[PDB]
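YM 10:42: Peptidoglycan Amidase Rv3717 sequence, as discussed on the call
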Amino acid sequence: IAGMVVFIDPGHNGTSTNSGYPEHTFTWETGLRLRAALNALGVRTALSRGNDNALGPCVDERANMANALRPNAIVSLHADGGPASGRGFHVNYSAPPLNAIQAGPSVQFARIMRDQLQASGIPKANYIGQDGLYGRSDLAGLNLAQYPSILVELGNMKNPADSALMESAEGRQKYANALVRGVAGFLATQ
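YM 10:58: structure's back
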């Protein structure tokens, strides 16, 4: 998988934990661990942003960045903010597909990522999607992608258990470890 290219998008503008730990900071730090892990594999990476200031780039500029780079894979990292009883990840992908990449490779990426997140010990969401996957038509960022692309909601920031992982350096590395197995797993198929 060395020499392949991955675009990493730490979610910014589509909540926070109870303690006030922001999504944009969680995704940033976890994104950097994922990047470092990928770099160790000889995988080439780009971030959607270069800092974790209060503002980040718009949905169109990030798409233009991703598409211009022609990555092997695009992975966006987010966290949810729904009912606190809800915990765990779900992997979002474009459906119905708007091109052939979305119809196949992006679905494969989503499936492999789902499998690896569970195996790495991150629980599949109990409150959304099915078995940790969610195909949907409403997200502009997935819809506009022309290369393999998924958007991972790593958990619900309002959930006590997810929050505990998110707020912890060790927890963020565990998410990153899971993520790299998912990314590396998909790249190997390509």
